[PDB]
Amino acid sequence: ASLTEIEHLVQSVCKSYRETCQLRLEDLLRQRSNIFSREEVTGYQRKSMWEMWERCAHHLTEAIQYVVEFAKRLSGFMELCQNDQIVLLKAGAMEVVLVRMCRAYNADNRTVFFEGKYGGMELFRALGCSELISSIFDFSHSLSALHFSEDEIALYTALVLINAHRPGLQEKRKVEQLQYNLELAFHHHLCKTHRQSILAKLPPKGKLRSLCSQHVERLQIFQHL
Template identity: 30%
Template sequence: MADGRGTGGWLVRASALIPAGALFAGSSPTPSEGTDQDKVQQAADSNSPKQPFVPCKVCGDRASGYHYGVTSCEGCKGFFRRSIQKQIDYRCLRDGKCMVIRLNRNRCQYCRFKKCLAVGMSRDSVRYGRVPKRSKSLEDHSVSSTDSATSSQDQLALENKQLAIYDVILSISQAHHSHCAITEDKIKNIVRQPATLMSKIHIPPGQIQFSNEELEVQRLLMWQQLATLVTPAINSVVEFSKRVPNFSDLSQDDQLVLIKLGFFEIWLTRMARMIDREENVMVFEDGSCISREELAVVYSPDFVTSMFEVCNGFNMLNLNDTEIGLFTAIVLATADRQGLSDTSAVERIQDSLVEALTLQVSRNHSTEENLFAAVLMKLPELRTLGSQHNDLLRWYRLQWHRGNLPPLFAEIYDIPKNQAAETPSQS
């Protein structure tokens, strides 16, 4: 197996930072209204100095009631509603670490939105209305003026942890939307067109079928055409990887190992939505529809059958774009890839991503108790396909001198570049 180091580390060296992508897509039920909430509402609306001051959990201003599951002011209530309904994209110029208080709450919308999510505001409650309320004891604990110093510290630590998790979720969501051509919105604009990997080769007059040599040439030509279709995704995966929190802190060699050895698994996860089982085709980001039969020639019938089955199973999980982004980031941060030097650092990255996906799934799919376990079960399935894919590449690696592959594709799979050849030999 290739160790992922290769030459030409420009895979990870090149690129300027790209502005954050799409808005965080996903959170779900938290508290709504009730008797205790009405009391807080009355206290917040009252002008009487005898009424207790109930702070907004987002900015600390006077709360006007329970909005989208959280004690909050009118300003934060309206801000959160607009952010969700208009699907606004935000950016932070200070690494997502701005303090959000009443006096500066309008200064950084990214951090204000992150704080809304972290304290429990529910995206689904904006879209669908009221949601189940939190237990009275938990709300009483959060607004009680008699909390002990220890409890306050615990609450602060919990809030900081939640903020850190939501920072990961937002970062991955924006990176995925910016650097994946196969998101829910982008798929709508893909225009399908029939395509083929087959290339015409010369057949001597009177010859009825291909010789073994001609079949090998045809297979190599088809693989080259497939490589051309896959290559745009390589740059997307590289750019996405560099925006995974703490990934860039790894050594360049370790970054290359993770990107190279994880690319096929990440690519296939993204492409799962593009498998059309009815027409038996895979649709690429440029709209090219390649038949299952042609893919089976490039790889093998059994391998392509496994590909389609794994993709179909993944689609049945009904994950949204943010969840797919988090899952592919987990695939990227696999600590037992051959050739890694700092496995502990990679494990820490993956642990934070798993925690983020756990929260994201639990909030978005609160009624599907076993969904997170089902998602994680896809990891070994992909790993098996990745190993089989690497085995299939061995034959192509031996034929490197007969073809000319796109440079990125050749580097991602550690295939020597044959700069002298333009096409595989047809003699």
């Protein structure tokens, strides 16, 4: 009920990202020149699928390991029952990772940050599902064509978690309110930055779900972590 407490929420959510920026954007941009040479690439291609999926599920579990803190520094988040605190992240934290990967994306050369270097999707010929791989590349490519800002990722990823239509919740009405205040806080900073035009350039609500869902099956056929 105050412009201060609304901006305070905006300023808060952006602070949670700055620490849970798993990667340093400065390093990401400064290392965008250091690229897996075709010799160094060819090493990854030999590995059987059972290797990369582990390496992938390792970094992903490590990447999620920074989403878990981020979720907990949000206003009123611990004021939920553990039921309505586990139901959220299991469905939500996965989609947050796919977002933060846009930071690690260089749409100039269509490359992504993998184990200290940048590499294309031929770095993943071993897995055997390039269509899913490419769809992730073009998805992150659909957020480089928006030139996202740090506080735009922090404010959108935060509204990926805070969904009240997640089944299994119990304190539902208690989640809607916290989602209301994040919708308005999101639109507000968009207005006061003249970036509200992207509200339609967004990938839909259903694209994010059908992406990692279509993948996490395959990650679970192998590692299941």
